[PDB]
């Protein structure tokens, strides 16, 4: 079955390159009519140890089955190349943000955020750090079901140049530990990224839109103050930053000063996610029990709502 063995690509037709997401093809199932999204995973099966490691990744995808994650449907082979087949979701959060220049309605933000935190939380409990949270990487169904894509397979088989392209593309959402070169980052980098989406979704403005990694740090520190000493040490030892000094800042512009209309509950949520010290950020499950989701029983009501959406939407 679609779970047991490699399937064939004969039943698929190409419909233009999806997206952003590397080489991800939009295809249609000739037999079912189902529209799908196909990514090229392996170039060559030949390397015996390589294949060994690919099966390790595929096995993990098949175990990351969740309502708020794009589903891997099947794996196909053609010649020496392997292709992962994912579901095709209607649109992205970025698409909604471009229709709504003043930000999203409060309840739409609650529903999108709750789902994002839920999907990320599941990743963390399976020892996966998503590392690529941004509006374009968060898909939305016609029924409003959020689905996270792009977490691990393509990134491992990637060039030093693809690593570099990724870091540039996610620049605005990268936590300070990443920007200074901490290679022992943890799950907390996703929480930071979620923090970034809070004010963006409400205000229709990116939070820290820097032009470079030094400029990114500057935007972060102007709002949130000095980096922790561990981060300063990494910065000073990082060849990327040779001849560059960390921002000194006389005047901090705190978040509530920048967005004085935002309620204290919303500000509190963002600040929790945006701790400069990643140890001080909450974990995902704690976030879902913030007042922002719990006032007027939103989280409870919405969990039931979401379960019916999911079952009739799929
Ligand atoms: O390792 C990987 C690599 C790639 C993916 C991945 C899986 C699925 C998708 C995907 C994207 C997508 N839908 C989509 C993507 C972009 C747009 C933006 N254009 C708007 C519609 C006009 C709209 C819809 N459906 N499925 C994208 C990437 C993945 O899940 C894991
Ligand atoms: Cl859909």
Numbering used by the authors: -7 to 11, 14 to 308
What does the paper say about this structure?
Here, we present the crystal structures of human CDKL1, CDKL2, CDKL3, and CDKL5, revealing their evolutionary divergence from CDK and mitogen-activated protein kinases (MAPKs), including an unusual αJ helix important for CDKL2 and CDKL3 activity. CDKL family proteins contain a conserved N-terminal kinase domain and variable C termini. The kinase domains of CDKL1, CDKL2, CDKL3, and CDKL5 were crystallized using a phosphomimetic Asp-X-Glu (DXE) substitution and in the presence of identified inhibitors. The CDKL structures all contain broad spectrum ATP-competitive inhibitors that bind to the kinase hinge region via 3 hydrogen bonds.
The prototypical structure, exemplified by CDKL2, conformed to the classic bilobal kinase architecture. CDKL2 co-crystallized in an inactive αC-out conformation with two inhibitors, CDK1/2 Inhibitor III and CHK1 inhibitor TCS2312. Their binding was stabilized by a collapsed P loop conformation that establishes potential allosteric sites for inhibitor design. In CDKL2, the ATP-binding pocket was sterically occluded by the P loop and activation segment (αAct1 and αAct2). This forced the αC helix to swing outward, breaking the salt bridge between the catalytic lysine (K33) and glutamate (E51, αC). First, the MAPK insert folded into a single large αG1 helix and loop, whereas MAPKs typically contain two shorter helices for recruiting the substrate Asp-Glu-Phe (DEF) motif. Second, the CDKL2 kinase domain was extended at the C terminus by an unusual αJ helix that occupied a site equivalent to the MAPK common docking (CD) groove and, thus, occluded part of the recruitment site for the D(ocking) motifs of MAPK substrates. Interestingly, the packing and orientation of the αJ helix was distinct from the C-terminal extensions of other kinases, such as PAK1, CDK2, BUB1, and NEK1. Notably, deleting the αJ region reduced the activities of CDKL2 and CDKL3, whereas CDKL1 and CDKL5 were largely unchanged.
